[PDB]
Amino acid sequence: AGRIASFLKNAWAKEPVLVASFAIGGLAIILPSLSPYTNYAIRINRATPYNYPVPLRDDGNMPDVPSHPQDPQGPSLEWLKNL
């Protein structure tokens, strides 16, 4: 409580560069685990179509696969437009 206060004061008086560096590194380590937009970053990465989407051979038992891109089925990037 007071020991850490005196140590931090001495460090800020003598080595401000090291204090700033350690603070920045600690924030960089800690903050990503508490952010709600990391999931958004992952989903943005998954949403980029680098390669061709190969169609599946219809067998009559896929209610959740579209037969046309404009069909309502499949993933939607409506969330991405407002983000």
């Binding site: 943005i44 980029t48 179509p49 680098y50 061709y52 991405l80 437009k81 983000l83």
Partner: protein
């Protein structure tokens, strides 16, 4: 027959001559400069976040153009 004329200080004397150091403070507080820097960083971060999200959307759009043209 004239007075004695010589190089002399004026009657009374000379005006004061400054010699002491003069290095005025002329500076802001540390908190002020740190706050300005942090605020500038936050403004830049927000602008870059918006711009990069828009860029990702544009990249997706042209990738889909490629996908449409591929067959």
């Amino acid at each position: 027959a004239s007075k004695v004329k010589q190089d002399m200080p004026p009657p009374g004397g000379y005006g004061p001559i400054d010699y002491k150091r003069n290095l005025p403070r002329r500076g802001l507080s540390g908190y002020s400069m740190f706050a300005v820097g942090i605020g500038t960083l936050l403004f830049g971060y927000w602008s870059m976040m918006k711009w990069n999200r828009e860029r990702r959307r544009l990249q997706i759009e042209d990738f889909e153009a490629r996908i449409a043209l591929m067959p």
